[PDB]
Every structure is written in structure tokens, then in C-alpha cells.
Amino acid sequence: GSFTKEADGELPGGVNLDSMVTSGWWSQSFTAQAASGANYPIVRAGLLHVYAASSNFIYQTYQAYDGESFYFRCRHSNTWFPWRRMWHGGDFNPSDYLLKSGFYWNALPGKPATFPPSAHNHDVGQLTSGILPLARGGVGSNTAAGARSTIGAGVPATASLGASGWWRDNDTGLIRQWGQVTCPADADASITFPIPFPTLCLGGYANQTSAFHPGTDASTGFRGATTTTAVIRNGYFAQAVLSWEAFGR
Amino acid sequence: GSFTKEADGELPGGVNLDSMVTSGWWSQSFTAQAASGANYPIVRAGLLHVYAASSNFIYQTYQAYDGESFYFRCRHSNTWFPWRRMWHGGDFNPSDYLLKSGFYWNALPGKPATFPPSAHNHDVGQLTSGILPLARGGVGSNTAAGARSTIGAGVPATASLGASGWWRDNDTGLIRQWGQVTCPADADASITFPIPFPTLCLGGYANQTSAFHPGTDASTGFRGATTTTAVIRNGYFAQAVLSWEAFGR
Amino acid sequence: GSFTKEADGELPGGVNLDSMVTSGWWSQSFTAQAASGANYPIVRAGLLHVYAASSNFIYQTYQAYDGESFYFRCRHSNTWFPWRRMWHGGDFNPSDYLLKSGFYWNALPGKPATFPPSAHNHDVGQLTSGILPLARGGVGSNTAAGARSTIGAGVPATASLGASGWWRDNDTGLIRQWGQVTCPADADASITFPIPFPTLCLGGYANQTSAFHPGTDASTGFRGATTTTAVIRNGYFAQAVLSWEAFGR
Ligand code: NI
């Protein structure tokens, strides 16, 4: 015979599609009747074609009535290969899926603005704001005086330690000064301090530097100090060199 | 004729599928015979259908016997379009591939816990533990005394630089004090230091502040110091004001 | 009838494929004639097959002449399901798309070398280079003397504050020393300073520690100092203990 414009028949229930082995075409009108059969490619009413090319090659196709898909298989040397299920547009759209050409860092969406960093070091120069406190090994200030205050440090004394000269505690302002003067016998001599006392001479004394004669007086006196001068008085009966110190601020 | 339930024939070797141009259907039973032909869509035994719609349109389909796939093409105006190879479930599964809807930061697996950071700065306040050592510009301690120790600094001297007063080196404890006293002629006067020496008066001296008469004695003496008092002795034959200094700790 | 090796006919323009409802096969030779019809699965010349299985099931297939694709649909209970468009190799290649198995951190290309970090803290020990300046709470140096210089600090005075002893300002080198000596009547006694003056004795004085007799002389003198010794002179007519101070550097 031939493939006729009328189907060869309706497939009932309980048909083994393996038994459909002469050429033709058959209609399964009921999904439920596909359910009660065997080797249907899908439980779905559908159209089956058989092409019995030879005893060793029986081809089949299956078109599901609702377009679930289209199926084909072949029996070769008394074994049925598995059905193939066509992919079609009702299954997926390729434009829904990620191309390899669009898989890179910049394209990845939802990337964080910043990232939790791992352990690392710094050069001190990357510290660009703030003031390190004492509790972290800092001096708690950006000024010299403030740093000293945080750690309780004084400032350096200054001095000029010459044969005549001065020394100054700059924490408090105290100044100490010294020198020598030649005094006339039983009389006064004026001295001029190496530097002026900024506000006030507080005290002083004079010392006989000579091997003054025993049994004679060799008294001394420091008096009448200004910011720049004082008066040294010599009790020895002869001209003598007296040394002196003075202090103030 | 018509499409018969028996195939029109078996395809041998060396068939050019371009020559298959009258309507019907033909079986290729041997992959090796497909190999020795031309314009097979795949080297595979299979079923070929020809639909010679007209001289200008010859359609063909090819079903591979092992389900490798299903193929179709058409000859239009004496040119054969290329075969189309159907995609089917034995080729790939779409659920194996990444959807664009699942391509975002949180979904990306294997992301590191932390990330190597790039160059950046800090405010000193983000330093929240540790003690900066001297080798990095720190003071190597969280205490004032420890900081001073790291850099070798002394503490401030204190003082009260009044007409009578005191000065104190707080590095060592040394205290220096001064004042004036009115002494009776050829006799002693007691002085009370501006502040007490914490443990010990170490020394002192007295100075005649007056223009004492020449040829008379104007000796002085500092003796008998406690922590709070001393005795100033006046050798001048008249009442006189003597100044004094004392030191201790 | 039967499916004949000659097509049932050529489809002209204006054909509604819904009306193609008796079994057979038909050729559309002109895309433009597909354009002027209805329910073509694609505007393309092509081959249409009809399988009228029953009044309730009319199946159709459509092969586009240029291989645009292959289409199928079915009329079930007087309603046409939509055409299915086969996916085929001319549409996409699955190996162009990203597998889920290749979607992980290391595979993502174009990842940055480093990443902008988010807010975070540090232990001071991760500061491993540089010298913190004063403007950031540092001492601007890795040396003790340099740190002192940045903040303007002095060094500690040293001393030995015994009954005889010394005190030294290490900012300037000034040394002050003191002690007592027993002097013979109207004569000299040598003293040896508690420590040597490194270069120079600058001055000194002596003080009578005794309740010297009034009306007698009790002058004193400090003279002839070296780096290690000086001479104390006693004007009192009796043996006496004199105290002294000396200063230098
Ligand atoms: Ni950092």
C-alpha cells in the first residue's frame, strides 16, 4: 500500500509503540490512552508516523497535539534507541541566558562599592588626618607645647658658661649669674650683670678671692641691685678681687 | 506515483544527496556507505525523505538512525541551502546553563572573605590598639613617664619667684630658697623657709645688704637649719638686714 | 487518495493556513505570497504538510525554504495551538553560553588586582615604615634627641643630694657642688669636690657654720679652684667648720 490521506487508524489504550512496526501513520486522540500504553515519548495525545525502511530499521516520529514537542527514534538491529525530544521556542529562549562574551567583572551587577580588606600594612605617611593620642603612643597634640604637656616634659635650660656668665631655667624664668670685680680698699664697686634680669634681681653675695691677711677684716656685701647693676662692697683694708653671684627673673 | 509503505530503495555507497531529487523516501543502512557519499548531513545511517515540490524547490529531511539528530534542507533555484541540525535533549540541557537572572554579585560562588586593598589613607582615629614605638615617630608608651623615658626628657622645674621664695628641680628634688631677715647687732635671728625642705636642708649662706661701715666687722653666718628654720648670725655692730639662700631636698 | 509524489498544489497569495485542513502537501513558492496570507509560521516560502487525522485533530508542519526553521502545530477541538519553532544550529551554539559549572570567582575574568576597601581599623603594629610627624601627634624622629628637638624638651638633671654632693643641669653642663671643711684658726684648708668639674670651676663661697664670737672677725674665702680642689680660708681666731658651694662645668 501507500501512505493514504486518511490515517491508518486511531490508537486506543494499551498500545506498545514498540509493536508499531509497519509503515503508516496513526492518531492517538486521548492523553489518557497514551498513559495506559508503553514507549510513548510523552504522555500526550499525538500523531505517530512509522517508516519501516527494512526489518533492521524502523523509524518513528511523534508530534504532540498540544505542541509539547516533536519526537523521533529508530529501531536498529531489534533495539529501540531512545526518543529524541526537540528543543523549541516554547522551551526556552537563548537570549535569556548569559553569553560567555558577557561574563566579565564590569558586567557583573550588584558589585559592592567597597570591600572588606584583608590584613595589610601601611607607611605612616598614609595617616593624613587626626592627632595620635598618648594611649596609642602619640603626644596628643600638633604643637610642641601641647606635646610637652601631654607627657609632662620641661623645656631646656639655656646658659653661657663663661668665666662671667649666666644660666637660665626656662621652665620658671629663674636666672643665675656670676662674675668678678676689682674693689678698692674699704669701699664699693659697681658690677654690670652679663645679661639684664628681665624684671627683678632677687639676691646675690660677694666672695673674697684673695689670701686676705689674718687678723684683718675681709667682709663682703651685695646690695642695691637693679635689673642690670649691683654694688659690691669690700671690707678688706686693701684693693681686692671679689667674685659674686646673683639670681632673679 | 505515491509515497508507498515500502521505501523506494536502499541507498548504497557513493550517493550524492544532491542527485536525490525525485519525491520519495530512501534508507541508508550503513554509516560507512554514508561516508563514501556526498552531502550527507552527518556520516550516519539514516532515513532520507525527498519532497520535490517543483523544479525550483526540492526539500529533504534526514533522520539519523542513532538519533544523532534530525536534518533538513532545500534546493532553491539550483542551489542547495545548508542542512539545519535540530537541537535536541541529547545535545544539552538548558538548566545546565546560567540564566541572566542568576548573574549577580551575591549569586557568584567562591567569593573571598576579604580582598587585597588598594592604596588608601586613614584618619589617626582608626588606630585603635597598640603603642607606636620610637622607630615610627611614637613615644613607645601610654604613660607620661614612659614617654619621657623613651625620648629621655626631664620634667618641668617649679618655683615661686617672689622677693622671698623657692625654686625646685623636680628631676632630682633639689630645692633652692631665699629671703631677708632683720638681725640685731652682734646677734642671731631665726628665719623660716618659704616652704619646708621635705627631708633635709643641705646648706646656706647670709649676705650683708647694707653699706656697712668700713673698718668694722660685718661677718655673717648660716647655721642650725632644720627642714623649716635656720639661724642667721650678724657680726655687724648695728642692726642690719641680711639676705640668705638655702638649698636642700 | 494518497500522499502523491507530486505535490497537491502551489499555495498562491492570500491563503489562510487555518483553511488547509485536508491531508496532503503544498508548496509556497513565494515569500511575498506568504506575506499576503494568514497563520503562516514565518513569512517565508516553504513546504506545508497536512495530516488530517480526524475532524478533531489536524496536524501541520512547515519547512522554510531557506532553512529559517521548521514549524509544527495542531488544531484540536476547533482551536489552533500556536506554531512551535524548532531551535537549530543556525540559531545559536550552546558552547557560546556560560555553563553553571564555569560560574565562580576564579573563572570570572577582568577582576581587579586590588579593591577599594571599606572603613576599617588597624593595630599600630601594622605601621611598618615612616616616621609620624608632629602634625599627626608624632615626635617627628626615630631618635631620642630628635624627638626632644621636635617638641622642645630638655633632658633630666642628675644629682647626688648627700650631705656633700653635686647637682648637674645636663641641658647646659652647669654643675653645682657643696660640702663642709674643718679649717684651722686664721688659716687655709683644702677641699676636694665630690666630683671633678669636667673643664672649669667658675666660682664658690664659704660660710661660717659656727656661733662665732661677736666682736671678732669671722671672714671667709673661696679661692684657687682647679677642676678637683679649692682653698677655703677662715678668718675666725679659732678652728671652725665652714661650709662651701662651688659651680662650674
Ligand atoms: Ni588600611
Residue numbers in the entry:
A (entry chain A), B (entry chain A), C (entry chain A): 443 to 691
Task: Reproduce the article's own wording on this structure.
R pyocins, on the other hand, are related to the P2-like myophage ɸCTX, and contain rigid, contractile tails.
The overall structure of the trimeric R2-NTF is a barbell-like protein, with a three-domain organization consisting of a “head”, medial “shaft”, and “foot”. The head (G443-M525) and foot domains (P598-R691) are globular and connected by an intertwined, helical, and fibrous-looking shaft (W529-V597). Of these, H562 and H564 form an H-x-H motif in octahedral coordination to a large divalent cation of ambiguous identity. In our R2-NTF Se-SAD solution, refinement of log-likelihood gain (LLG) maps revealed a peak at this location differing in displacement from Se-Met, but consistent with predicted scattering from iron series elements (i.e. Fe2+, Ni2+, or Zn2+). Although we are currently unable to conclude which metal is present at this site, R2-NTF structures were deposited with Ni2+ bound at this position.
